[PDB]
Amino acid sequence: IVYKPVDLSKVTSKCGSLGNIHHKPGGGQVEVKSEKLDFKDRVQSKIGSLDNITHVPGGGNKKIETHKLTF
């Protein structure tokens, strides 16, 4: 009996922003005027001009291998 399995396989995730070219990106002028506002609960606010954003909660990788020889 000769048990010689070969795993030579590849398991790859490429997730998010990759290999992109951004040549001279111009964000515009941004003006925010706020007067006499009331907030009675949680506020989360973002003000910008140019943003690049990547989260990637994903791209997770999972390999399970089992080898049994019974005689």
Next chain:
Amino acid sequence: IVYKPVDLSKVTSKCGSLGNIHHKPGGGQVEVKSEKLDFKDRVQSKIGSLDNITHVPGGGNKKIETHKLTF
């Protein structure tokens, strides 16, 4: 008995923004005027001009491989 399986396979995810060209993207002017506003519950706000956004909760990658030889 000779047991010589070969896995040479490739298992790949390419997820999100990739290999893109963004040549001279121009965001416009943004003006926000807020006056006399009332909010009684959670506020989440974004103000911008030019955005690139990739989330990728996906692109996850699962391999299961079982070998049994029973004599």
Next chain:
Amino acid sequence: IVYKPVDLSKVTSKCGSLGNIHHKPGGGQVEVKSEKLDFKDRVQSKIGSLDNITHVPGGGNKKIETHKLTF
């Protein structure tokens, strides 16, 4: 008995925005005027000019292999 399966497969997902060319995209001028508004529940708000957005919850990848030799 000779057991010699060969797996040489490719299992590939390409999901989202890829290989795109965006040449001189111009976002327009955006003006938002909000006066005397009342909100009694959750607000989620986005103001922009030019956006690129990719979510990709998908593109997930799953391979299962079982090899049995019983004698």
Next chain:
Amino acid sequence: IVYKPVDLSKVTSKCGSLGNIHHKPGGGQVEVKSEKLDFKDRVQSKIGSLDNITHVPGGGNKKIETHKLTF
């Protein structure tokens, strides 16, 4: 001008299991035998004899009133 609306209303939900009588309910004998099982997947398993279960995602209640007098 006299503005004297009277609201004496009831808005009621009764949802799930209520006002029931269960007299000497007898669960049977339960035997589960599991041998040589393989699971490649999420397993959610319940073994019991006698159950009473109420979920009630519903029964939600919503009342909106607006009173305007303009002169």
Next chain:
Amino acid sequence: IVYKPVDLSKVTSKCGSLGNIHHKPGGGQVEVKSEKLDFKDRVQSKIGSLDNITHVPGGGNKKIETHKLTF
């Protein structure tokens, strides 16, 4: 001008298990025998004999009033 609106209303949820009688409820004998089992992912298991269960994600209650007098 006499603005004397009256609210005397009731807004009620009764959700889940209530006012029930369970008289001598008998769970049976439960036997679980598990041999040589393999699990490759998340397992959630419950073994019992007699259960009473109430979830109630629901039964939520929401009242909104607006009163305007404008002159």
Next chain:
Amino acid sequence: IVYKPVDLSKVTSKCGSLGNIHHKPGGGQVEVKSEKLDFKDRVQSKIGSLDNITHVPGGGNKKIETHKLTF
């Protein structure tokens, strides 16, 4: 001008298990035998005989009043 609105209303949630009678509930005998088991991921297990369970994520209560007099 006489603005004398009266709220005398009630806004109530009764959620879960309440006003129930459980008279001599009998859990049965429970036997769990496990031999030669393999688990490769998170296990959550509950073994009991008699259970009473109430979660109640719900039953939430929300009242908004706005009173305006403008002259």
